[PDB]
Amino acid sequence: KIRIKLRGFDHKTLDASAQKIVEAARRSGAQVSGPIPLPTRVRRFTVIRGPFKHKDSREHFELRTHNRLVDIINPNRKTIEQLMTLDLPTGVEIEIKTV
Amino acid sequence: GNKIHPIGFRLGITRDWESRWYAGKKQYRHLLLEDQRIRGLLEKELYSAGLARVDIERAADNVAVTVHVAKPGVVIGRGGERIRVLREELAKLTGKNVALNVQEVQNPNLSAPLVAQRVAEQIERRFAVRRAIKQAVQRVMESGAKGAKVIVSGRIGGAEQARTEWAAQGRVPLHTLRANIDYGFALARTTYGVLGVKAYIFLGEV
Amino acid sequence: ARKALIEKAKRTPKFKVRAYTRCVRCGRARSVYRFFGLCRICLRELAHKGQLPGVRKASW
Amino acid sequence: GKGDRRTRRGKIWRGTYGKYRPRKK
Amino acid sequence: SLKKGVFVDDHLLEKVLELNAKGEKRLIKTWSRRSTIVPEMVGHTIAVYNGKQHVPVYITENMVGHKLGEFAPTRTYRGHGK
Amino acid sequence: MEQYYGTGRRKEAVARVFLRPGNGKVTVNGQDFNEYFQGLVRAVAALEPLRAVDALGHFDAYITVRGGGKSGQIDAIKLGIARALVQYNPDYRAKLKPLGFLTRDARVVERKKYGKHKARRAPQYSKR
Amino acid sequence: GIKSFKHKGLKLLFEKGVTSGVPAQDVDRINDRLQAIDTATEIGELNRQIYKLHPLKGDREGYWSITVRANWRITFQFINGDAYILNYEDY
Amino acid sequence: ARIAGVEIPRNKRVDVALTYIYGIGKARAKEALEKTGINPATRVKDLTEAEVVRLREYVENTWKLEGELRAEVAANIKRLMDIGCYRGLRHRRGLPVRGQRTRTNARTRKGPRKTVAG
Amino acid sequence: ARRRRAEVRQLQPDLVYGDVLVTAFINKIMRDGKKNLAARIFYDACKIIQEKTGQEPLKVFKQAVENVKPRMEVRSRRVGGANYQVPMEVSPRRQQSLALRWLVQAANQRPERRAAVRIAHELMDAAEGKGGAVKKKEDVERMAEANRAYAHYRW
RNA sequence: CAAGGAGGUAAAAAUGAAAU
RNA sequence: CCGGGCACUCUAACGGGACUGCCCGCGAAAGCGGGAGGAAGGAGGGGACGACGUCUGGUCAGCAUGGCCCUUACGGCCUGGGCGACACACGUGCUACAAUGCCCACUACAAAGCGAUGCCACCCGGCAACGGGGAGCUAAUCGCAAAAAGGUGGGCCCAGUUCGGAUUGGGGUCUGCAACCCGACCCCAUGAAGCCGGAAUCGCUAGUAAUCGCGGAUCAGCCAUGCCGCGGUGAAUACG
Ligand SMILES: [Mg+2]
Ligand SMILES: [Mg+2]
Ligand SMILES: [Mg+2]
Ligand SMILES: [Mg+2]
Ligand SMILES: [Mg+2]
Ligand SMILES: [Mg+2]
Ligand SMILES: [Mg+2]
Ligand SMILES: [Mg+2]
Ligand SMILES: [Mg+2]
Ligand SMILES: [Mg+2]
Ligand SMILES: [Mg+2]
Numbered sequence A: 001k002i003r004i005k006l007r008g009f010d011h012k013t014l015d016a017s018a019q020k021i022v023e024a025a026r027r028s029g030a031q032v033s034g035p036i037p038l039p040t041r042v043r044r045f046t047v048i049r050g051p052f053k054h055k056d057s058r059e060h061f062e063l064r065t066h067n068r069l070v071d072i073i074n075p076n077r078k079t080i081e082q083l084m085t086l087d088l089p090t091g092v093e094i095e096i097k098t099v
Numbered sequence B: 001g002n003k004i005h006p007i008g009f010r011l012g013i014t015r016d017w018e019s020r021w022y023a024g025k026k027q028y029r030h031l032l033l034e035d036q037r038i039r040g041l042l043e044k045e046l047y048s049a050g051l052a053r054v055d056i057e058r059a060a061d062n063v064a065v066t067v068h069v070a071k072p073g074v075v076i077g078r079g080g081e082r083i084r085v086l087r088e089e090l091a092k093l094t095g096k097n098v099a100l101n102v103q104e105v106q107n108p109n110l111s112a113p114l115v116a117q118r119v120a121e122q123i124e125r126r127f128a129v130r131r132a133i134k135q136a137v138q139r140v141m142e143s144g145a146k147g148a149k150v151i152v153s154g155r156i157g158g159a160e161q162a163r164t165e166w167a168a169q170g171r172v173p174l175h176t177l178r179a180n181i182d183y184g185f186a187l188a189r190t191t192y193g194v195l196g197v198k199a200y201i202f203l204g205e206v
Numbered sequence C: 001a002r003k004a005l006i007e008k009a010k011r012t013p014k015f016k017v018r019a020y021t022r023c024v025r026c027g028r029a030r031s032v033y034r035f036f037g038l039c040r041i042c043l044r045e046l047a048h049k050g051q052l053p054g055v056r057k058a059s060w
Numbered sequence D: 001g002k003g004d005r006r007t008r009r010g011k012i013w014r015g016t017y018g019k020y021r022p023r024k025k
Numbered sequence E: 001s002l003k004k005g006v007f008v009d010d011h012l013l014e015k016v017l018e019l020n021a022k023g024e025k026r027l028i029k030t031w032s033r034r035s036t037i038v039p040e041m042v043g044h045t046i047a048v049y050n051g052k053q054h055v056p057v058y059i060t061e062n063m064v065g066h067k068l069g070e071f072a073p074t075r076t077y078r079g080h081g082k
Numbered sequence F: 001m002e003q004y005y006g007t008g009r010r011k012e013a014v015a016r017v018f019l020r021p022g023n024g025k026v027t028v029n030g031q032d033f034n035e036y037f038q039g040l041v042r043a044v045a046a047l048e049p050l051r052a053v054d055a056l057g058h059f060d061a062y063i064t065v066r067g068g069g070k071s072g073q074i075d076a077i078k079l080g081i082a083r084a085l086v087q088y089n090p091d092y093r094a095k096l097k098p099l100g101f102l103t104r105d106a107r108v109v110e111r112k113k114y115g116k117h118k119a120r121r122a123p124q125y126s127k128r
Numbered sequence G: 001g002i003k004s005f006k007h008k009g010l011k012l013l014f015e016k017g018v019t020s021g022v023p024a025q026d027v028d029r030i031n032d033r034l035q036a037i038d039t040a041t042e043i044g045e046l047n048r049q050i051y052k053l054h055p056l057k058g059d060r061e062g063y064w065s066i067t068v069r070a071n072w073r074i075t076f077q078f079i080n081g082d083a084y085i086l087n088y089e090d091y
Numbered sequence H: 001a002r003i004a005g006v007e008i009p010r011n012k013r014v015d016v017a018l019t020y021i022y023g024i025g026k027a028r029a030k031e032a033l034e035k036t037g038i039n040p041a042t043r044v045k046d047l048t049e050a051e052v053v054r055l056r057e058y059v060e061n062t063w064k065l066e067g068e069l070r071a072e073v074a075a076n077i078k079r080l081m082d083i084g085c086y087r088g089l090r091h092r093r094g095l096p097v098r099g100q101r102t103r104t105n106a107r108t109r110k111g112p113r114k115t116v117a118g
Numbered sequence I: 001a002r003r004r005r006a007e008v009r010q011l012q013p014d015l016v017y018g019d020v021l022v023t024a025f026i027n028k029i030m031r032d033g034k035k036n037l038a039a040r041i042f043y044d045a046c047k048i049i050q051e052k053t054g055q056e057p058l059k060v061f062k063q064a065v066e067n068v069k070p071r072m073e074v075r076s077r078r079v080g081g082a083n084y085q086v087p088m089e090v091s092p093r094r095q096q097s098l099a100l101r102w103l104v105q106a107a108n109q110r111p112e113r114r115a116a117v118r119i120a121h122e123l124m125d126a127a128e129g130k131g132g133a134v135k136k137k138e139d140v141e142r143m144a145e146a147n148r149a150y151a152h153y154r155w
Numbered sequence J: 001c002a003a004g005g006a007g008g009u010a011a012a013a014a015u016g017a018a019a020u
Numbered sequence K: 001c002c003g004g005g006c007a008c009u010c011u012a013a014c015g016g017g018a019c020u021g022c023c024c025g026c027g028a029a030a031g032c033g034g035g036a037g038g039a040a041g042g043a044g045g046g047g048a049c050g051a052c053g054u055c056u057g058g059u060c061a062g063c064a065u066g067g068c069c070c071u072u073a074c075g076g077c078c079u080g081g082g083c084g085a086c087a088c089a090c091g092u093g094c095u096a097c098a099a100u101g102c103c104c105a106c107u108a109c110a111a112a113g114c115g116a117u118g119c120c121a122c123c124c125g126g127c128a129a130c131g132g133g134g135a136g137c138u139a140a141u142c143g144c145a146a147a148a149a150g151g152u153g154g155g156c157c158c159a160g161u162u163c164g165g166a167u168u169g170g171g172g173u174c175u176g177c178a179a180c181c182c183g184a185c186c187c188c189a190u191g192a193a194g195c196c197g198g199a200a201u202c203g204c205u206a207g208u209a210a211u212c213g214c215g216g217a218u219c220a221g222c223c224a225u226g227c228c229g230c231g232g233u234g235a236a237u238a239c240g
């Protein structure tokens, strides 16, 4: 019933921090749908390489925003207990909602 | 010439970020401006420390700020000032958790920003630049470096004629990705103008 | 006209259409990205610095 | 007639819709 | 092309209407084409600014959607060598 | 009713090919292998690996397709049909190689590169 | 008589006395030269040693060039007692 | 058939033949024959005289067309004669009315190139 | 400087025929990369061949190409600011290419209305030895004929 | 199978640029 | 669409995968040619990467900065004008000159990206632009979008003609304090030049040229036919 979403710019921190919550939910009495890899939202932009006025030949950058989903079954305060405030991100945004 | 910033050229693999936080739109713009104003405010009254980095991390009103310094001499024991209101003056336009840490950069002769900054000081001391370059390189090479390279360009020793002094010992492969190459830069302000100091420090990888 | 001109860019009163974007790091009025609030010049500088969270070189 | 404002083809090219090119169904 | 607005300058009209009761003098300036021809005070002259000076334009019916400054060219041209 | 693998891809096109051992040479997806591919000459070339083998309608085709346009889909179907008959007939390998019906064909649309007008077409100049 | 300008800064210095288009230390210099080119009734008058006068070659044929200072030139076309296309440029 | 001021178009579809009149174009064309109730794909070759009469009576009336509306259009430009606006001066000088680019192009009103050279 | 001799491109055989030639012809018909319209026109014209003559288009088309084959062509070469025109032999690859190219071009040169009838007729004319392409072929061989003088320059 | 000594030699295509 | 399942497809995270390693031939070696080996090969196809240096190259109008000059002003604010001017010349382009074409209707097949101070389903008024409503969507959920060339049917029948769309008149919409100078669309009527380009000149060697539409940045709006991307169909030729 409990749905958690984890967005992030770094994939290595995401693929690891959203895997901790798979271990911290499985070893507390619940069935956990593993790291669901939602598609990425790549936000590119292309900037002229020079401060002057050399239109041809520039250089572009991208801001990949990754999405990862995990669902746990029963909202028992046994699994809730651990995932309550035992948070270890580096800024990774987490969404917790039940529906 | 034309060569890409050896830091940006890595970023992903080798050399991580310097401001590590995540946000969507309507927030990124505000938090980046604040973030940059922290870097701007710190650089001023903390230059005497000579800061190699200014790492920043966030987590909803958490704002962690790690200041790497060769010699953290300007911290002086708890209530001995140089930290108290100093790490608290940040929250005069922030008001968030101003968690300011201090790191001890062990060898300053292996920190590119510090190397270039030491050189740029010497330019303003009216030192002989070519000899200053040579020494700084060997100094870096003396402290165990796998390769080094310092570059001062323009208006050397005053004198109407922009020059470019060049020195580099050992190995500095800029094209390679598994490089671990530290890059630093510094503005030397002189009574006759402005000149830039590049500093490249290289260690192994694989 | 540059100092009094980066004043108006933040002042923003009097008719809603007279307000415009403006790089914060610089004072550039052109090629100002809404996402960063920066000109294309400054944005490139900081992206190479590493001071742009997540922002990375694009190769494909 | 990619530039004639009285065709489904010119309306495509211009982008906009209208009588010569209705917004589907 | 407005339809439910169809506007004239309030300040142009203030000066134009309070100088319209039982008659007036043609001494009346402006600084904005922005307005519109305005019926009533047709037998009037409106010195419109063209960027350099105030050109006395005259109203004699015939004009409507043409605000003002169309009766006040801003350029000169006049000729190209010939 | 039945199943036989199916993974044919060509230039952003995905086709899952099944075939069910029955004399009814049939179709899939929208309408007929015709109908859905009518007016298209090269559409019927996807059934050439069946001609390469001894299949004059021994299977009931079932290919769900997606992505790309018709031609790529048709190409992908060819790769899927072949991928089926090579799967449940491992000895039918000695015809998918000489005839070359088994290749994903990495030939895909090349990226728009800056400066150039489109892929490789240079923007054209005059010195004067 | 000077009759046409190509350089805006030059134009403003001679017409309105606007000096903000030229170098500040070359104001007097450029002025005395322009007045000389204005008073000149023939190219032979623009021949003082301090001007280093000469006609240009190639595509710039028909033009002349007196020296202001350093690598800086005032170029023009002199014809029938008048100079045209007064430009300020590098050598 | 001498419909308005013209008669020319013979064997060539009435919805098309109609077009050959200053005032008809394409929209008023099918609009006129659906309102008159006549088959558009007909021969134009003098078919049923009745259909031709009804068509003529409706078309030639209703809206202004041919030489009459050419006169009105020319008179609408003559409006900006007197002491007219800016748009009139553009009709005076022979230059484009809608304020476009005249540095190049604008040949459809200026006419073929004249070349000054200097 | 052509270090590689540029290997000969190979095609896909068509539908119903299996030609290693017809598809090459359909390609020349093809404009803007529409093989659908291209192939259709040829097969259309194939249906048109059946009408005016009781012959199978696979031979009518085949023989037409064979009749629009340049035995030898003229080649401009060396010494004198490239002044000479040595008449050279034509490679089977080039006869191939010229035949199909001249066919389609001459076909669209015809005053007919539909693309199919142009193709069909130009093929029938060429199969006989009458086509405008056959003119082109015979013309190119005239040029090669008149240059036998310094043909011994060869190469 | 390896070369020295001998001979016919390109064409029609001119200028130079604006302080060291 | 539900029950249920997640093997297929896809999604995105780490991996496996060829190194001419294996066979023939050539060679002193490097290596080259050829062959089953497989999705792939003798740098697989594209990116990011630009040596010492050169051009007194470019940029004091991104920014920084030595020097020179201006300070009731070379600074500051405002309304209006101008950057959009047009007898002309060059560059890069878009749309065409038609029948492998144009118009109308029906009916399919993408990728890559953007949106809750917005994208706006479905209705309602309206020929239409668009307006009234109003659901879902912090968005592999909802929306932008039906991709277009294609296919089927039908109509023009080769004439500047249902090719072509310039130019101009009239009527309207939407953003905006306001669109005359100088906004984009919509509708009616006009319908120009052009019937394929002189001397010259450009691009591209395989998904490539050509052709077709789609997205984004900036952005109240938009002068975008531009730029940066995405995929659809898909040639010709290389002797030398
Ligand atoms: Mg360009
Ligand atoms: Mg802006
Ligand atoms: Mg493409
Ligand atoms: Mg204009
Ligand atoms: Mg000479
Ligand atoms: Mg010389
Ligand atoms: Mg490399
Ligand atoms: Mg220079
Ligand atoms: Mg400056
Ligand atoms: Mg401009
Ligand atoms: Mg004509």
Ligand SMILES: [Mg+2]
Pocket: K195
């Ligand atoms: Mg014609």
Ligand SMILES: [Mg+2]
Pocket: K205
């Ligand atoms: Mg190549």
Ligand SMILES: [Zn+2]
Pocket: C023, C024, C025, C026, C027, C028, C038, C039, C041, C042, K062
């Ligand atoms: Zn800036």
